[PDB]
Write a protein that binds this DNA or RNA. Structure first.
Ligand SMILES: [Mg+2]
Ligand SMILES: [Mg+2]
Ligand SMILES: [Mg+2]
Ligand SMILES: [Mg+2]
Ligand SMILES: [Mg+2]
Ligand SMILES: [Mg+2]
Ligand SMILES: [Mg+2]
Ligand SMILES: [Mg+2]
Ligand SMILES: [Mg+2]
Ligand SMILES: [Mg+2]
Ligand SMILES: [Mg+2]
Lengths: 95, 109, 116, 324, 52, 119
RNA sequence: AGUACAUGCUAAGACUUCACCAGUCAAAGCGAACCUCAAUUGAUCCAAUAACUUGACCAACGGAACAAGUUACCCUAGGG
RNA sequence: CCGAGCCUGGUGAUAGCUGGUUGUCCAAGAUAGAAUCUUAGUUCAACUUUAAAUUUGCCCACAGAACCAAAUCCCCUUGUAAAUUUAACUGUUAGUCCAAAGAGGAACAGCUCUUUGGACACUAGGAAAAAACCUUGUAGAGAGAGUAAAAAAUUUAACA
């Protein structure tokens, strides 16, 4: 990514991450699984059940995505009818 | 002229060994051929992986082998045995520790 | 397991064989593989005598290899059956042969010829 | 590293050089049979059981068997598989001779001896029978092992047994509310003259059983003692509680049990009546509450887990907003 | 030798699922389960997807 | 509610039951047992018992099997065991006398199918 | 490759090729009857399609969307 | 200075390559591997550093771990003080030799390739000189003391 842009001197988000992932405000990143629409004629229904899921990322993976987007995407978004709205907080943690 | 054979290990074996306290659904042992046979509250998947079905303690015993008669290979191998010979094979059981649930007071009418 | 006291409680290939002249060395004298041609004019009598000689063979611990037959001949048709027999002692040879001699129903001839 | 075994090696005595001279498994059934007798036998390794565990009568029977098999009609009905057997005579002759053996089997299945007498088994010799009169038309038979609704058991039983004093206990070994060890009596008729019930000395009056709602089934044992010498004894639930073990121990010098019959009760409306009308009690309602399902410690970053992981650990399913 | 074909609903319109079928044998008419009607529905083969 | 030994999948018989009827047809006497999972015999029906033996012509035929079927179905009626999981081997299931035993079980009032556990 | 079209929908808990991506087993529930083999394989973007789906011997098989021989004229930064 | 002039500008072009990176003290601190137009390189990982929350970490004993030798896994007591998790980053990974279990090569190589255990890259005494062999480790001064390891032994053939 670009740490200092040539016009403003600001950090730039890579737009692949924005167009492919979802940020929860608790700090978790939601993604699809690779190849949920490719070659499912040869795929058993357990495998296409597993591939059709909203899957989280590892700690290092989530930090690598956090370093590749900026402070706009890290923010509390109070939408009207977001399906993922209930998942923005992490409850009953004992770490 | 020996091409191929660079496959890595399967990492199979015993996952939750005798004495380990095991809950429901945990894989006890993954095997390539039938090394073990299921016992009490123990299920088998399609790839011959062997899982616990109730919460408890995994124990290993060795018991009689009297298979299902539609499995003609083992039954025909039985009819190659002499009179005193009976196959013994290893079995996995889970002794259930936690009870079914408890009768408790709910409403006092 | 290899190190437990119960090692090899489930081995079975030592109990299974996963696989011809006479054996007369010095004291244990043994026949080879036999061929008993039960030839008769009737399928019924020859088949029944083959069944009965087979039932006396399996009840007296005699190894029976094959119970086949060769094709008949045009003449009246002559049927026959072959019962291969191995496992005898000299006293048992006398007794089994005289039982076969004394068990002939009607006009059926015998043979105890060797292989080939 | 091979170590010698502890006990005898199985499948070792038959290990000969000539297995063909030994007689052979022709069938599939002999093998499972033999495996069953050895599986019932104990071994020196770890097994499943360790963790989850005169002449005149014979002559008369032979004569009766010869006379019955000599009938042409019986053989003709047997070869055509049309013959039938009257169940009443067989049931009666079972009740005389070998009924008590099946009765100890059924009582030891129900845990009656291990808690009623703390493992002290006996032989209930007497072919006991009880019946609860339903309507004016029928009567429900209390033998051992059945189920009776407390509507049927609202009234005092009629007890029939062919014998010659006697004592009569009704025990609810599992109906206790406070103690997990005691039991509640319901009726106890001592000094029975012969086989008539009405002339006996009642100690505690008859009360219908109370299996509370959701408390499962309750077992009720009719315990019938022989009596040699007449012995004097003695709706509050604190007065209805005692243990049968020490109660039998206090009198066991001339006191031998000879009859058992146990049956089951479930919740119904007569149980509401038995708490409400003459006990003056609010009904305690029980439910079989399962333990909470397992979930592991909630990780910071649920790698490869689905989105539902944020609903495994959530207790209230409504949108919370925090400070806003 | 085999062709991956698409297997198209008679009822539960807009629902299709694919199978494998021989190059030489006859045209598939099958009883699958449609979750729109949530019943066993006869399906008819319309278009082949790819001959493998 | 109570657990069944749901495993023992590879081996015959399956132990996922509460009460098992096992019939051994010996050379002379045919017997049927009803058991718990503990291996303990709950209900016995034998032709080694004079009350049913004296009413039978031969202790082994279809007739003796039907008689002991009626007897054990009655016995389970007074014993309170109302539900079954019965596993015959496929060659014995095609036999006439034990399918008459199954018919006797059905007419007696003991269902040859235990209800599923509630989880 | 073969059989079958519940090779349906969901859903506790686990294994895992030493990471990741990938894969695997699955209690219970809804809805119903009453899979074998060991490898038998390919990610993203892009295209075809209203949709469900599909597309490489991308075999250099974690694949860049498409690019050969020769230099005793060779040159440059290094190593033996 | 022509296998393609020279000068200026783009241009501080580019290079995974070479070399260099400057005061003190203390403390912690060394060798799995998977990918990769990839083996001079990089990412993940293993190890390592700091801070924080919490409780078990290591050694382990009976029992236990499949059919076609050393051993290893699991593991209460005991000795011990460490471990897991969270927050945040850097840096190393053709290692070399010896003992042992193996393979290739000549059952040569200071030759190459796996596994277990040491040692060297961290102090010292000894074996002649000595990265790897034996003894020995946590730091200073003494013109005190007890020790460890520590020196190669061999010299022969008459015959009735
Ligand atoms: Mg290999
Ligand atoms: Mg490898
Ligand atoms: Mg892995
Ligand atoms: Mg299921
Ligand atoms: Mg490549
Ligand atoms: Mg490659
Ligand atoms: Mg530069
Ligand atoms: Mg230091
Ligand atoms: Mg390089
Ligand atoms: Mg431990
Ligand atoms: Mg010191």
């Amino acid at each position: 990514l670009t740490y200092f842009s040539a016009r403003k001197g600001k950090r730039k988000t890579v737009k692949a991450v924005i167009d492919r992932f979802l940020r929860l405000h608790c700090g978790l990143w939601v993604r699809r699984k690779a190849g949920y629409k490719k070659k499912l004629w040869k795929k058993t229904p357990a495998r296409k059940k597993r591939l059709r899921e909203f899957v989280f990322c590892n700690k290092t993976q989530s930090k690598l995505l956090d370093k590749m987007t900026t402070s706009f995407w890290k923010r509390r978004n109070w939408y009207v009818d977001d399906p993922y709205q209930k998942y923005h907080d992490r409850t009953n943690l004992k770490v | 002229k020996n091409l191929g054979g660079k496959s890595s290990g399967r990492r199979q074996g015993i996952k939750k060994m005798e004495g380990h306290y095991v809950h429901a659904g945990n894989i006890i042992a993954t095997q390539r051929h039938f090394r073990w046979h299921p016992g009490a509250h123990v299920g088998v998947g399609k790839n011959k992986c062997l899982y616990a079905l109730e919460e408890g303690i995994v124990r290993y015993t060795k018991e009689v082998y009297v298979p299902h008669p539609r499995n003609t290979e083992a039954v025909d191998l039985i009819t190659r045995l002499p009179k005193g010979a009976v196959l013994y094979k290893t079995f996995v059981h889970v002794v259930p520790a936690k009870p079914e649930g408890t009768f408790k007071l709910v409403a006092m009418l | 397991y290899k190190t437990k006291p119960t090692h090899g409680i489930g081995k079975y290939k030592h109990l299974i064989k996963a696989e011809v002249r006479a054996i007369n060395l010095g004291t244990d004298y043994e026949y080879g593989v036999l061929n008993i041609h039960l030839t008769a004019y009737d399928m019924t009598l020859a088949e029944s005598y083959a069944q009965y000689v087979h039932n006396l063979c399996n009840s007296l611990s005699i190894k029976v290899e094959e119970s086949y037959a060769m094709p008949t001949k045009t003449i009246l048709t002559t049927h026959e059956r072959v019962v291969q027999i191995s496992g005898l002692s000299a006293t048992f040879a006398e007794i089994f042969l005289e039982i076969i001699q004394s068990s002939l129903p009607e006009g059926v001839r015998l043979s105890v010829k060797e292989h080939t | 590293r091979r170590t010698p075994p502890l006990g005898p090696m199985p499948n070792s005595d038959i290990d000969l050089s000539n297995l063909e001279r030994l007689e052979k498994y022709r069938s599939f059934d002999r093998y499972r049979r033999r495996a069953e007798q050895e599986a019932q036998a104990p071994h020196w390794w770890r097994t499943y059981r360790e963790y989850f565990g005169r002449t005149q009568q014979l002559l008369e029977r032979k004569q009766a068997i010869q006379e019955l098999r000599a009938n042409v009609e019986e053989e003709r009905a047997a070869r055509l598989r049309t013959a039938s057997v009257p169940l009443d005579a067989v049931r009666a002759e079972w009740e005389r001779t070998c009924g008590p053996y099946h009765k100890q089997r059924l009582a030891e299945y129900y845990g009656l001896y291990r808690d009623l007498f703390h493992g002290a088994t006996f032989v209930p010799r007497v072919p006991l029978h009880v019946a609860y009169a339903v309507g004016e038309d029928d009567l429900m038979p209390v033998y051992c092992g059945n189920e009776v609704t407390p509507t049927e058991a609202a009234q005092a039983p009629e007890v029939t047994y062919e014998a010659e004093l006697w004592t009569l206990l009704l025990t609810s070994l599992d109906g206790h509310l406070l103690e997990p060890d005691a039991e509640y009596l319901h009726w106890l008729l001592t000094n029975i003259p012969g086989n008539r019930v009405a002339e006996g000395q009642v100690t505690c009056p008859y009360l219908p059983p109370f299996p509370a709602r959701g408390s499962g089934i309750h077992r009720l044992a009719f315990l019938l003692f022989k009596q040699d010498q007449p012995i004097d004894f003695s709706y509050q639930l604190a007065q209805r509680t005692f243990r049968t073990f020490d109660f039998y121990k206090k009198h066991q010098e001339t006191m031998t049990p000879a009859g058992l019959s146990f049956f089951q009760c479930r919740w119904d409306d007569s149980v509401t009546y038995i708490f409400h009308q003459l006990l003056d009690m609010r009904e305690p309602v029980f439910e079989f509450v399962r333990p909470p399902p397992y979930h592991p410690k909630q990780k910071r970053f649920p790698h490869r887990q689905p989105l539902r992981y944020l609903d495994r650990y959530r207790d209230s399913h409504e949108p919370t907003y925090g400070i806003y | 030798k085999n062709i991956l074909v698409r297997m198209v609903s008679e009822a539960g319109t807009g629902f299709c699922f694919n199978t494998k079928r021989n190059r030489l044998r006859e045209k598939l008419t099958l009883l699958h389960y449609d979750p729109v009607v949530k019943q066993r529905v006869l399906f008819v083969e319309k278009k082949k997807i790819r001959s493998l | 509610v109570a657990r069944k030994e749901r495993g023992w999948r590879t081996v015959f018989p399956s132990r996922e039951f509460w009460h098992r009827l096992r019939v051994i047809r010996t050379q002379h006497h045919v017997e049927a047992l009803v058991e718990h999972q503990n291996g303990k015999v709950v209900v016995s029906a034998s032709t080694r018992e004079w009350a049913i033996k004296k009413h039978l012509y031969s202790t082994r035929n279809v007739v003796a099997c039907e008689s002991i079927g009626r007897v054990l179905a009655q016995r389970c009626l007074e014993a309170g065991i109302n539900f079954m999981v019965y596993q015959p081997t496929p060659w014995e299931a095609a036999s006439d006398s034990m399918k008459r035993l199954q018919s006797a079980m059905t007419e007696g009032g003991v269902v040859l199918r235990e209800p599923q556990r509630i989880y």
